[PDB]
């Protein structure tokens, strides 16, 4: 029989695609305006052996997977599925994507930007989560699971090479990148590559914030050009997963130029290709086979005033300060959007609601305690509820050898380096051989940089939220958990995670009604596609539609090109959805209370020559009935020559 059985589910999680801020940038301005790909969940579900122990991975195509959703997804899970499925077996991870909607934050500082919450995201996110958890496990099956490891030195660049060269330790990061990803492949009882998950840092911000289009950005190209363009087994699912990506950027040139681009779409495809790249070499070799027990261990960790042994300090005693944001250098600002949320109260009724940014002093302790860092926002102190979490999930499954971290935050290069070391010296005995560090996983606490990092006070720094010592503190965290798993003992009886779905504000407007152009009604085609195009030419289309926001039409799409045959009477076939790489779904604002749905397709080589035609699936509100009805068109068709 085989060691293992693993199950590839994926389902869609795409939020709101149009006027809900988007998460990353924390830019009050980019709110979405339509599609270019749509955001997935990828789960892998991992059986081991005689047991039936089961481990599950979802990686996410968002800015993060923040506490509330970890905490509803688990308790959905642990309600419908009681006894398989809790905290302990649960890992759940982001590719740290730019261009997906935000406000499924439950604290008031993720959700700034994006005037609050916005519940219709959040559970589009959670029930897509369980939605391909449910589709994995579906698909359990006997198999073989694989690690490889290579090293990736053109597709990333450190943007706090000053911080990073702090480090006295950094043999082997001396350029500011962490070269290298890992892989493990999952392969079916025919010896077939089924799907796999690749670790590798760097920031899905190959998108800029001057995007509005919903986009899974380089990673989830890297996903998509495997499972869509390259992959002919079906139920393929490949994941793109972080690891301490905290000062990795994508944009090798320091923007919106990585290696020598200048567009960032060009600039999302090519580092998502070399990602895939990568990955997929490494997949091919097989390097090493992945074998024995499959265990876990979770703790959600209370960081207030946590003690931090001196073992891990500078000799001394410390206890973890409580959340602040200091301010940093930029100009405008980096690695993408506006920044250290100086997001002016003035357009924002949610941050005047919180009640500004600032309120009377930091107590004077907090402000030693913070060390170097210079702050500018005390959201610990913050009433009636702290603006940023308190309590943590810190996670650790075991595969095999290999052992994969689950941690809340993002990481700096160095920061992870020596977690990962800390956790493979003390995991050694254990048979642990490779240790995988996700971040970006179960929550969100912003930034870790090592104390000497921390003391530059760069963007990182002053993002590092609970001091000095926050890198020592998920040090000894992860060490005191791994031992624990060496050992065979629990872990420590777990803090109490706050439920904070009683209080959520929002301050963001909903659809109030749509109306279709004057004259005109739903559907209609407002822009006709030319009568022929060639192969590379971009057919571009327009309808009379409604506001996205009044379905997120999850699992399905805003658009369909159609083929129909080479004399266009053949039983219609579609090629491209909105999830498609080569189309795009734009939403816009025209007159009042209309909106024009703008259709684009890249004829991509190798496309049947015939014809063609685009349809277009919607949803509009109306005032007095407050109902939402399905509307739609249809072009003419066009022909596709060959070319
Ligand atoms: C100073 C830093 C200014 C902007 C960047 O830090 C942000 C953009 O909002 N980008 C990320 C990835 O965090
Ligand atoms: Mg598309
Ligand atoms: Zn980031």
Same mark, same amino acid.
């Given at each position: 029989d085989?060691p ?7 389902? @869609? ?8 801020? !988007?998460?990353g ?5 980019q709110?979405?305006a339509?599609?270019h ?7 892998? =579900?991992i059986? *081991?052996?005689?047991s039936?122990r089961r481990?599950?991975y =979802?990686?996410?195509?968002?800015? $993060?997977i923040?506490?509330? =959703? ?11 599925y009681?006894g398989?499925?809790?905290?302990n077996n ?7 994507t ?10 008031? $500082?993720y959700?700034?930007?994006?005037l609050? +919450?916005?519940e219709?995201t959040?559970?589009?996110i959670?029930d897509?989560?369980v939605?391909?958890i ?8 006997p198999?073989?699971? /694989? ?6 030195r053109n597709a990333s ?16 990061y001396? @350029?500011?990148? @962490?070269?290298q !990803?890992?892989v493990l ?6 010896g ?18 001057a ?6 950005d ?6 998509y050009?495997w ?22 950027s994508?944009?090798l040139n ?9 567009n ?8 998502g290709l ?6 997929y070499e ?15 261990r979770?703790? /959600?960790?209370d960081?207030t005033?946590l003690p931090?042994?001196? *073992? +891990?300090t500078d ?9 602040a ?6 100009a ?11 997001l002016e109260?003035?357009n924002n009724p /949610? ?8 309120t ?6 907090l402000?030693?305690?913070?060390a170097?860092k ?14 940023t979490?308190?309590?943590?999930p810190?996670? $650790?499954?075991?595969?095999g050898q290999?052992?994969?971290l ?7 290069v160095?920061?992870?380096?020596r977690i990962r ?10 048979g642990?051989?490779?240790?995988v ?12 940089t ?9 963007y990182?720094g002053?993002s590092?939220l ?19 798993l060496?050992?065979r003992?629990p872990?420590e009886?777990s ?5 904070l ?15 279709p ?7 209609d ?11 590379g ?7 009379v ?7 997120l ?7 369909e ?5 080479? @004399?266009?009477k053949?039983?219609?076939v ?16 025209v007159?009042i ?5 703008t ?18 699936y ?7 009935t ?12 066009? *022909?596709?020559?060959?070319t």
């Amino acid at each position: 029989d085989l060691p293992y059985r693993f199950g590839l589910g994926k389902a @869609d999680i795409t939020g709101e695609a149009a006027e809900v801020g !988007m998460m990353g940038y924390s830019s009050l301005e980019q709110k979405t305006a339509g599609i270019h790909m749509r955001q997935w969940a990828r789960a892998f =579900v991992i059986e *081991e052996a005689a047991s039936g122990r089961r481990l599950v991975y =979802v990686n996410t195509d968002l800015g $993060m997977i923040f506490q509330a =959703v970890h905490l509803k997804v688990l308790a959905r899970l642990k309600a419908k599925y009681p006894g398989v499925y809790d905290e302990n077996n649960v890992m759940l991870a982001a590719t740290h994507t730019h261009s997906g909607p935000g406000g499924f934050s439950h604290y008031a $500082m993720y959700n700034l930007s994006v005037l609050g +919450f916005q519940e219709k995201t959040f559970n589009a996110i959670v029930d897509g989560i369980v939605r391909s958890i449910e589709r994995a496990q579906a698909r359990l099956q006997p198999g073989r699971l /694989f690690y490889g490891s290579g090293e990736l030195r053109n597709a990333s660049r450190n943007r706090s090479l000053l911080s990073h060269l702090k480090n006295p330790d950094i043999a082997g990061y001396e @350029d500011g990148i @962490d070269p290298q !990803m890992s892989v493990l492949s999952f392969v079916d009882a025919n010896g077939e590559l089924a799907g796999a998950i690749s670790w590798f840092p760097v920031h899905s911000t190959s998108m800029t914030n001057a995007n509005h289009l919903i986009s899974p950005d380089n990673k989830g190209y890297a996903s998509y050009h495997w499972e869509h363009d390259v992959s002919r087994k079906s139920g393929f699912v490949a994941a793109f997963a972080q690891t301490n990506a905290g000062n990795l950027s994508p944009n090798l040139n320091l923007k919106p130029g990585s290696g020598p681009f200048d567009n960032e779409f060009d600039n999302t495809r090519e580092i998502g290709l070399r990602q895939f790249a990568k990955a997929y070499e490494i997949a091919g070799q097989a390097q090493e086979e992945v074998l024995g027990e499959l265990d876990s261990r979770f703790r /959600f960790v209370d960081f207030t005033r946590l003690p931090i042994r001196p *073992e +891990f300090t500078d000799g001394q005693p410390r206890q973890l300060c409580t959340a602040a944001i200091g301010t940093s250098l930029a100009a405008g600002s980096t690695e993408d959007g506006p920044g250290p949320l100086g997001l002016e109260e003035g357009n924002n009724p /949610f941050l005047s609601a919180l009640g500004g940014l600032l309120t009377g002093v930091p107590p004077q302790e907090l402000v030693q305690c913070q060390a170097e860092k210079t702050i500018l926002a005390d959201t610990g102190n913050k009433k009636p509820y702290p603006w940023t979490p308190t309590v943590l999930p810190i996670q $650790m499954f075991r595969i095999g050898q290999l052992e994969l971290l689950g941690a809340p935050a993002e990481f700096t290069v160095m920061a992870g380096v020596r977690i990962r070391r800390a956790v493979q010296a003390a995991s050694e005995a254990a048979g642990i051989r490779h240790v995988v560090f996700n971040g970006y996983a179960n929550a969100y606490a912003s930034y870790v940089t090592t104390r000497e990092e921390y003391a530059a006070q760069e963007y990182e720094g002053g993002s590092t939220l609970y001091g000095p010592w926050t890198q020592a503190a998920y040090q000894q965290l992860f060490v005191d958990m791994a031992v624990a798993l060496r050992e065979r003992l629990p872990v420590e009886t777990s803090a109490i995670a706050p439920d904070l779905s009683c209080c959520q504000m929002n301050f963001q407007t909903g659809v109030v009604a749509d109306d279709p152009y004057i004259g005109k009604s739903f559907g209609d085609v407002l822009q006709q596609p030319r009568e022929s195009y060639r192969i590379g030419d971009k057919v571009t289309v327009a309808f009379v539609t409604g506001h996205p926001k009044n379905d997120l039409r999850t699992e399905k799409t805003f658009l369909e090109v159609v083929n129909i045959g080479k @004399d266009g009477k053949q039983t219609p076939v579609t090629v491209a959805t909105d999830n498609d790489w080569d189309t795009q779904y734009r939403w816009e604002r025209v007159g009042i209370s209309a909106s024009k749905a703008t259709i684009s397709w890249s004829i991509p080589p190798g496309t049947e020559p015939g014809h063609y035609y685009i349809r277009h699936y919607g949803n509009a509100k109306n005032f007095w009935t407050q109902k939402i009805s399905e509307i739609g068109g249809s072009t003419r068709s066009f *022909e596709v020559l060959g070319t």
